[PDB]
Amino acid sequence: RFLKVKNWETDVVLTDTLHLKSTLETGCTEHICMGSIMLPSVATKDQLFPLAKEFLDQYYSSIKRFGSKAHMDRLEEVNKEIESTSTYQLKDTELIYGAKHAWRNASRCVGRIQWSKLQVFDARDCTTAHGMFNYICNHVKYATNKGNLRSAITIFPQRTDGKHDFRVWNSQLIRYAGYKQPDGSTLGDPANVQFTEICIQQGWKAPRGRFDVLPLLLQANGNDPELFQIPPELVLEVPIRHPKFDWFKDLGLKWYGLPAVSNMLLEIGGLEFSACPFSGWYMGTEIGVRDYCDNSRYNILEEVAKKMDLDMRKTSSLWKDQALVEINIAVLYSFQSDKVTIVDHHSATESFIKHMENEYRCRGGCPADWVWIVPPMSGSITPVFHQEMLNYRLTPSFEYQPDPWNTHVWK
Amino acid sequence: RFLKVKNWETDVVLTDTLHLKSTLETGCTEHICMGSIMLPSVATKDQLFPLAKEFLDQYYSSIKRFGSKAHMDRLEEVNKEIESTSTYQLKDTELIYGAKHAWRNASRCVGRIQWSKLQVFDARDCTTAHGMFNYICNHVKYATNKGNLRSAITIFPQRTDGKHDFRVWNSQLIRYAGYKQPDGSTLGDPANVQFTEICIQQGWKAPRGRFDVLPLLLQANGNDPELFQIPPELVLEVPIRHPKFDWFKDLGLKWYGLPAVSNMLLEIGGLEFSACPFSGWYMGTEIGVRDYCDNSRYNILEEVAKKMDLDMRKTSSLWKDQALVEINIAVLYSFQSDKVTIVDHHSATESFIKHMENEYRCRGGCPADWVWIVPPMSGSITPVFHQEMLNYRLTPSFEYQPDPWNTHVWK
Ligand code: HEM
Ligand code: HEM
Ligand SMILES: N=C(Nc1ccc(CCNCc2cccc(NC(=N)c3ccco3)c2)cc1)c1ccco1
Ligand SMILES: N=C(Nc1ccc(CCNCc2cccc(NC(=N)c3ccco3)c2)cc1)c1ccco1
Ligand SMILES: C[C@H](O)[C@H](O)[C@H]1CNc2nc(N)[nH]c(=O)c2N1
Ligand SMILES: C[C@H](O)[C@H](O)[C@H]1CNc2nc(N)[nH]c(=O)c2N1
Ligand SMILES: [Zn+2]
């Protein structure tokens, strides 16, 4: 009832009791482990109050007035509003608490040492896609901060019935378009090919190039989504160069500075926020390794190896690995030379071990998903590879949710 | 009851029913995933017969005479011998079946495409440590095959009471010694420092250098273990050079060609083989990444970066990664130029995906441990990173077992 996780590079041992508070299920059983399954899988007023109570008990405990007067009043207050309205509404302070702890509890996030430095934008007063666009631009401007990136989340109105849902249809606020060609191959980002075509289906006019920043497709209160183009001056970009290889500029690559996922769902006290774009900053490998060198992505290991003068004949010449490291030196170098916030997989993973310590001390644990925490290159030369991690689901939390075009009733 | 695993780089989907036959437990629950815990945790005659029956049913099913005459006779035959002797004995064919399937079921093994090409050496007639030495030398000679390595296992007598146990005290038949210095630091291999000192405690005379091949410490039928030096002509070594950097020879590194774990425990039909050294061949990264560049191992990223002329000031210069790829090009290059069998993490992981296909088709599944299958460098540029894997425990199986010096009664 008090589990042990060990680091096999420092012999450090930490004891986990936080998993006790766990509640949601993981997909694993006693006889099958699903820790490498990518996605493992309206709400009534009965279910809603334990969840509100649970949440409120930790919120007041966190400001050191658990079970007190102001607590039991709010517990009663929310009880009454759930009877009356069949749902309820979070205080501004409760929303900011919930959000930050949804991030704190994100077991796949290696960035959580920053979880308490999160700027919460309350867009729960929003009613239209244009208001969403306006809130999102302000999010993008604020979080970017001229390259001194700041973490932020904008939280649109909670789901109510279910047919009234606020959704950002983009998977990230800033994404490069993907177009398939006549010869099957893909210009731009292959990951977004279907979304890029949804934007054209609803009206986008595509500059059919590479790094074309997609428009926002914004759905408000269940209505059909509408297209908006982020003012380009708000979309900060780092052109990627290499600190030794001047042919690297000729590759003509760039990436946006601001990673902001917008397709996820924030759960706080049983309430569901289907549109809650959050941004922080990139770890280099997300761009250099996955974005650039995934096969079903920009897939540039071919060209970079070529220009490097590489033995591409034999698999075992590690030409793929060799080009992979150069691409990531270039990503980091480029971003830092432009004073755009980026972290390398070594700093980020040491910080996560440091974060893990603090959590086990002042919280009794840290849910962590090794499969996702270990960076996609140079696994074992980073301290998280050697760190045992217990994965369990705590709430408040960020959840996967269906793509809104699979679920929506159009017209 | 029929689970789906997906490859997110090829969109290939495979369906797992093999996990049904699973029986042993994984450490995970519905509310906690332990897929990154490194080690998750006498036998009576009651327990022994279902296990024998279970095993025999799959063995006869595998030669296409399930439940037949020759089956029910052996089922009865083993039933009677378990009543009589309180244990039993495997046919030569049953031992070879069990062993190969213990390997087939090793979910952390990326090498299993070869599982049916395994040479089984029956050393169940062994009675003394000298016989163990002799069987082990023959294993080493055969498996090495002058560098055209062949997979093999030597199986010493099963555990009986528990105080009579055959054990190889080494963790691998061929390992480099580790000595701590006056100034705390370590010459040779730090991993083996305690074992290297156990060998001195029982009588070894250490050439206190780097790549000193340890002696065998062999325990027979529970008796105290005895030291033997593998004839050096049987210990094949690859001196590591780089195909471009002639200063790499100056590093003066070498590794043994033969990976043979000997500290594990083979379970077949409920019988327990506490001494069952198995060997195959190395994937490059085990040497180049873990052996050489683990912090608590040879830890040579320092010196290789230096000689490469590298920006070692800033963590984010990826100098660690850059030196890591060169070290692994050198390992592979060296081994292949010496006609010593080695596989690169790209060939090995593509083969495992290919292996995974065959298993899901002609077996209904393949237990796999993503945490261990993904190589310790260049994770996502290999196809196994993108392959969802279900981990579950099938039998026959290889199991972890206590180090014999923590459990043994000396004198
Ligand atoms: C501040 C700097 C941050 C860094 C360096 C960082 C880093 C990362 C990385 C590398 C991943 C893996 C994602 C992938 O491979 O696609 C991840 C996952 C995640 N991050 Fe963080 N992140 C940061 C901030 C945040 C913030 C501010 C939030 C929420 C408010 C957040 C929530 C999450 C969630 C929910 C996931 C898992 C999503 C999924 O399962 O796909 N992160 N993070
Ligand atoms: C034939 C070529 C083989 C290759 C390339 C290979 C590769 C690997 C690798 C890289 C690992 C991870 C081990 C580590 O990181 O320390 C592993 C694990 C393992 N292999 Fe294979 N292996 C081979 C043959 C075999 C054979 C012949 C057997 C048994 C008869 C076997 C049984 C196992 C077991 C039981 C594990 C897991 C051990 C543990 O959990 O520590 N392997 N293999
Ligand atoms: N579609 C695919 N699967 C698939 C792949 C990935 C996912 C989830 C991706 N989370 C994206 C994500 C999530 C969280 C953080 C970041 N990054 C940051 N720094 C960041 C953003 C905000 C703060 O920090 C990126 C879901 C499905 C696929 C892959 C290959 C072919 O297909
Ligand atoms: N002691 C530590 N933990 C720890 C680390 C590892 C283990 C298990 C290691 N299995 C070793 C192993 C197992 C199977 C295959 C290979 N390889 C092959 N090719 C091979 C051999 C035979 C056929 O193929 C290597 C157990 C405990 C540690 C790590 C860092 C500091 O401490
Ligand atoms: C199949 C596997 O679950 C999939 O590749 C996961 C593995 N780990 C990951 N880790 C991160 N950070 N991001 C990812 O997309 C993935 N993908
Ligand atoms: C903590 C973690 O479980 C540990 O580092 C594991 C991770 N994956 C591994 N994978 C392999 N192949 N070998 C290992 O030693 C490990 N170590
Ligand atoms: Zn699990």
Side-chain angles (χ1 to χ4, degrees):
Chain A
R1 222 69 257 243
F2 345 82
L3 284 163
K4 292 282 183 73
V5 320
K6 186 176 169 186
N7 187 305
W8 292 88
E9 189 203 11
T10 65
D11 287 298
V12 163
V13 174
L14 297 168
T15 316
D16 193 293
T17 63
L18 188 56
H19 75 277
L20 292 162
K21 307 270 171 24
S22 165
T23 182
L24 236 180
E25 296 176 33
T26 60
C28 308
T29 60
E30 303 78 20
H31 324 95
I32 199 159
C33 175
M34 306 198 124
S36 80
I37 303 299
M38 175 97 72
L39 342 110
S41 182
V42 67
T44 87
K45 35 197 145 182
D46 316 283
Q47 325 145 328
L48 233 64
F49 189 67
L51 296 168
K53 177 191 213 318
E54 186 196 334
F55 171 77
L56 290 176
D57 281 288
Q58 25 189 118
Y59 169 62
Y60 283 110
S61 218
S62 82
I63 66 190
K64 277 148 191 178
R65 294 115 122 284
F66 161 60
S68 76
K69 173 110 207 88
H71 182 145
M72 296 295 170
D73 279 332
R74 180 101 181 97
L75 220 66
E76 178 86 333
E77 174 173 48
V78 179
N79 198 39
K80 296 161 155 179
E81 177 180 9
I82 293 172
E83 306 283 3
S84 159
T85 337
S86 68
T87 160
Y88 74 95
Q89 297 298 317
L90 293 159
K91 295 286 170 201
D92 281 15
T93 57
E94 297 171 352
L95 193 75
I96 298 156
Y97 172 92
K100 293 188 179 190
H101 283 261
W103 179 14
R104 198 187 199 193
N105 299 335
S107 55
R108 302 180 158 170
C109 177
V110 75
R112 295 177 277 168
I113 201 207
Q114 282 277 28
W115 76 270
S116 73
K117 279 223 155 237
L118 175 73
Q119 178 55 40
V120 174
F121 292 111
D122 183 354
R124 278 176 312 165
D125 64 358
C126 192
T127 62
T128 53
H130 272 90
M132 293 173 73
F133 175 61
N134 185 56
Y135 269 116
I136 284 174
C137 291
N138 292 342
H139 176 139
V140 170
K141 205 179 207 183
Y142 172 93
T144 301
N145 187 31
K146 299 191 299 287
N148 183 22
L149 275 31
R150 295 172 289 189
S151 301
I153 187 166
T154 304
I155 295 165
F156 292 106
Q158 61 212 48
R159 172 174 294 142
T160 40
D161 63 332
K163 193 48 238 160
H164 299 98
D165 261 8
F166 286 67
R167 298 286 314 261
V168 191
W169 283 35
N170 308 57
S171 20
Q172 306 181 12
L173 301 184
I174 296 171
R175 300 218 72 173
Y176 296 132
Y179 324 89
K180 21 149 124 158
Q181 298 293 61
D183 60 307
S185 61
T186 295
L187 179 56
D189 196 325
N192 316 303
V193 167
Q194 187 189 357
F195 183 72
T196 289
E197 292 169 359
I198 288 147
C199 292
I200 311 157
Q201 282 275 323
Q202 299 307 150
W204 197 43
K205 298 268 81 204
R208 299 215 192 232
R210 211 99 138 106
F211 306 109
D212 312 350
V213 171
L214 289 143
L216 302 170
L217 241 203
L218 306 175
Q219 156 185 4
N221 201 39
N223 291 275
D224 304 339
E226 309 166 23
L227 284 168
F228 315 80
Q229 168 225 147
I230 308 110
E233 66 268 27
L234 293 190
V235 178
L236 173 63
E237 290 175 291
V238 180
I240 314 292
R241 61 270 190 191
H242 200 286
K244 318 280 185 173
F245 298 79
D246 262 79
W247 51 268
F248 210 97
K249 333 177 174 328
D250 292 286
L251 290 164
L253 308 162
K254 62 177 167 189
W255 203 256
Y256 45 95
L258 185 72
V261 303
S262 26
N263 52 7
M264 283 194 90
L265 191 162
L266 166 58
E267 179 164 303
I268 298 167
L271 304 182
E272 295 184 330
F273 300 92
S274 43
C276 55
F278 54 91
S279 66
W281 50 79
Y282 267 121
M283 187 175 63
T285 58
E286 304 176 61
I287 302 168
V289 185
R290 311 304 308 295
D291 286 343
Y292 283 159
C293 299
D294 261 10
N295 266 326
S296 358
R297 293 296 296 294
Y298 271 81
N299 193 14
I300 71 164
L301 281 170
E302 300 272 39
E303 269 311 275
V304 177
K306 283 198 45 181
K307 296 200 165 54
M308 282 187 68
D309 210 49
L310 281 194
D311 175 14
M312 278 183 52
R313 292 159 294 193
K314 277 69 189 179
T315 147
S316 55
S317 57
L318 303 193
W319 65 271
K320 265 185 173 153
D321 309 55
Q322 211 156 17
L324 183 88
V325 174
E326 306 288 321
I327 292 164
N328 282 266
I329 288 170
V331 172
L332 296 187
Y333 174 74
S334 313
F335 269 61
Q336 302 159 312
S337 294
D338 285 355
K339 237 63 157 65
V340 185
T341 307
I342 192 159
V343 67
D344 63 75
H345 49 290
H346 306 275
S347 219
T349 54
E350 196 230 303
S351 90
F352 181 73
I353 294 289
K354 208 156 168 283
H355 171 60
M356 251 186 124
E357 283 167 32
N358 309 329
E359 290 283 273
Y360 275 84
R361 166 165 32 84
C362 72
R363 193 187 193 201
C366 186
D369 184 340
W370 193 107
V371 166
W372 290 64
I373 297 288
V374 173
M377 72 180 295
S378 315
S380 43
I381 74 173
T382 74
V384 289
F385 181 96
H386 313 280
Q387 180 65 55
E388 289 171 0
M389 289 161 214
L390 290 178
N391 196 17
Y392 46 90
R393 301 234 275 187
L394 298 182
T395 201
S397 78
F398 288 105
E399 300 298 358
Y400 281 130
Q401 75 183 327
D403 285 332
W405 53 88
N406 300 339
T407 41
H408 192 37
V409 178
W410 264 86
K411 298 206 229 192
Chain B
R1 222 69 257 243
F2 345 82
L3 284 163
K4 292 282 183 73
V5 320
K6 186 176 169 186
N7 187 305
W8 292 88
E9 189 203 11
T10 65
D11 287 298
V12 163
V13 174
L14 297 168
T15 316
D16 193 293
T17 63
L18 188 56
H19 75 277
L20 292 162
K21 307 270 171 24
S22 165
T23 182
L24 236 180
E25 296 176 33
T26 60
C28 308
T29 60
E30 303 78 20
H31 324 95
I32 199 159
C33 175
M34 306 198 124
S36 80
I37 303 299
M38 175 97 72
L39 342 110
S41 182
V42 67
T44 87
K45 35 197 145 182
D46 316 283
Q47 325 145 328
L48 233 64
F49 189 67
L51 296 168
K53 177 191 213 318
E54 186 196 334
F55 171 77
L56 290 176
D57 281 288
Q58 25 189 118
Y59 169 62
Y60 283 110
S61 218
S62 82
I63 66 190
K64 277 148 191 178
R65 294 115 122 284
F66 161 60
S68 76
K69 173 110 207 88
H71 182 145
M72 296 295 170
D73 279 332
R74 180 101 181 97
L75 220 66
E76 178 86 333
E77 174 173 48
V78 179
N79 198 39
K80 296 161 155 179
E81 177 180 9
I82 293 172
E83 306 283 3
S84 159
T85 337
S86 68
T87 160
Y88 74 95
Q89 297 298 317
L90 293 159
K91 295 286 170 201
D92 281 15
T93 57
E94 297 171 352
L95 193 75
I96 298 156
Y97 172 92
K100 293 188 179 190
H101 283 261
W103 179 14
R104 198 187 199 193
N105 299 335
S107 55
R108 302 180 158 170
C109 177
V110 75
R112 295 177 277 168
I113 201 207
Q114 282 277 28
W115 76 270
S116 73
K117 279 223 155 237
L118 175 73
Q119 178 55 40
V120 174
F121 292 111
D122 183 354
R124 278 176 312 165
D125 64 358
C126 192
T127 62
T128 53
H130 272 90
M132 293 173 73
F133 175 61
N134 185 56
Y135 269 116
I136 284 174
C137 291
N138 292 342
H139 176 139
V140 170
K141 205 179 207 183
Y142 172 93
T144 301
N145 187 31
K146 299 191 299 287
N148 183 22
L149 275 31
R150 295 172 289 189
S151 301
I153 187 166
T154 304
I155 295 165
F156 292 106
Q158 61 212 48
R159 172 174 294 142
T160 40
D161 63 332
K163 193 48 238 160
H164 299 98
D165 261 8
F166 286 67
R167 298 286 314 261
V168 191
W169 283 35
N170 308 57
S171 20
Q172 306 181 12
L173 301 184
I174 296 171
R175 300 218 72 173
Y176 296 132
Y179 324 89
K180 21 149 124 158
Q181 298 293 61
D183 60 307
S185 61
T186 295
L187 179 56
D189 196 325
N192 316 303
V193 167
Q194 187 189 357
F195 183 72
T196 289
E197 292 169 359
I198 288 147
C199 292
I200 311 157
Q201 282 275 323
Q202 299 307 150
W204 197 43
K205 298 268 81 204
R208 299 215 192 232
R210 211 99 138 106
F211 306 109
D212 312 350
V213 171
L214 289 143
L216 302 170
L217 241 203
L218 306 175
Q219 156 185 4
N221 201 39
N223 291 275
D224 304 339
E226 309 166 23
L227 284 168
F228 315 80
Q229 168 225 147
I230 308 110
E233 66 268 27
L234 293 190
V235 178
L236 173 63
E237 290 175 291
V238 180
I240 314 292
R241 61 270 190 191
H242 200 286
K244 318 280 185 173
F245 298 79
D246 262 79
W247 51 268
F248 210 97
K249 333 177 174 328
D250 292 286
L251 290 164
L253 308 162
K254 62 177 167 189
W255 203 256
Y256 45 95
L258 185 72
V261 303
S262 26
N263 52 7
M264 283 194 90
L265 191 162
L266 166 58
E267 179 164 303
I268 298 167
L271 304 182
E272 295 184 330
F273 300 92
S274 43
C276 55
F278 54 91
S279 66
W281 50 79
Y282 267 121
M283 187 175 63
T285 58
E286 304 176 61
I287 302 168
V289 185
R290 311 304 308 295
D291 286 343
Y292 283 159
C293 299
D294 261 10
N295 266 326
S296 358
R297 293 296 296 294
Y298 271 81
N299 193 14
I300 71 164
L301 281 170
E302 300 272 39
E303 269 311 275
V304 177
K306 283 198 45 181
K307 296 200 165 54
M308 282 187 68
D309 210 49
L310 281 194
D311 175 14
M312 278 183 52
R313 292 159 294 193
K314 277 69 189 179
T315 147
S316 55
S317 57
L318 303 193
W319 65 271
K320 265 185 173 153
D321 309 55
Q322 211 156 17
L324 183 88
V325 174
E326 306 288 321
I327 292 164
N328 282 266
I329 288 170
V331 172
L332 296 187
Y333 174 74
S334 313
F335 269 61
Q336 302 159 312
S337 294
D338 285 355
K339 237 63 157 65
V340 185
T341 307
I342 192 159
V343 67
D344 63 75
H345 49 290
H346 306 275
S347 219
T349 54
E350 196 230 303
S351 90
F352 181 73
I353 294 289
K354 208 156 168 283
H355 171 60
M356 251 186 124
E357 283 167 32
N358 309 329
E359 290 283 273
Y360 275 84
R361 166 165 32 84
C362 72
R363 193 187 193 201
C366 186
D369 184 340
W370 193 107
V371 166
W372 290 64
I373 297 288
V374 173
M377 72 180 295
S378 315
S380 43
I381 74 173
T382 74
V384 289
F385 181 96
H386 313 280
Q387 180 65 55
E388 289 171 0
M389 289 161 214
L390 290 178
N391 196 17
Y392 46 90
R393 301 234 275 187
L394 298 182
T395 201
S397 78
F398 288 105
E399 300 298 358
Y400 281 130
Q401 75 183 327
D403 285 332
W405 53 88
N406 300 339
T407 41
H408 192 37
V409 178
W410 264 86
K411 298 206 229 192

